[PDB]
Design a binder for this molecule. Structure first.
Ligand code: HEM
Ligand SMILES: CC(=O)Nc1cc2cccnc2c2ncccc12
Length: 106
């Protein structure tokens, strides 16, 4: 899966989470998100393809997934404890991570 594919997975699954009723779908979606985030972490985006791997832009980019992955884990712990509404608020919060990265690198 390339970067676009992983982004679609992140987006589709975030929509499942916000619309859901139940812990099962929230857990499942978060789990798919986690996978997609770890996969995207290895990618170099179009805007950065001419930078060096240890340019601040590139380290910034990786840092944003590392945050996202941590946030997904936090929501997933919540969902595992049956705090569906709380897990769901956690998912909404981490849109900031999506949006702040897109603002620079999309
Ligand atoms: C859960 C959070 C996120 C969601 C919902 C999300 C959603 C999406 C979507 C719908 C697109 C368009 C994909 C396409 O062209 O078909 C996209 C593109 C992109 N996203 Fe995200 N994203 C998220 C997190 C991130 C993060 C954290 C970053 C950077 C750390 C990021 C970097 C990018 C890049 C660089 C593009 C453009 C990729 C390209 O055109 O090849 N995204 N994202
Ligand atoms: C500071 C940082 O996270 N650098 C990196 C950031 C990266 C971001 C996306 C793709 N690869 C890298 C990378 N690859 C090899 C060595 C370092 C990096």
């Amino acid at each position: 899966a390339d970067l676009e594919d992983n982004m679609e997975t992140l987006n589709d699954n975030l929509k499942v989470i916000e619309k859901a009723d139940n812990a099962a779908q929230v857990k499942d979606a978060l789990t798919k998100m986690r996978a997609a985030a770890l996969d995207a972490q290895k990618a170099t985006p179009p805007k950065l393809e001419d930078k060096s791997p240890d340019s601040p832009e590139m380290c910034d980019f990786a840092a944003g997934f590392a945050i996202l992955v941590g946030q997904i884990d936090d929501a997933l712990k919540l969902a595992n404890e049956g705090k569906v509404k709380e897990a769901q608020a956690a998912a909404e919060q981490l849109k900031t991570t999506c949006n702040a990265c897109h603002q620079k690198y999309r």
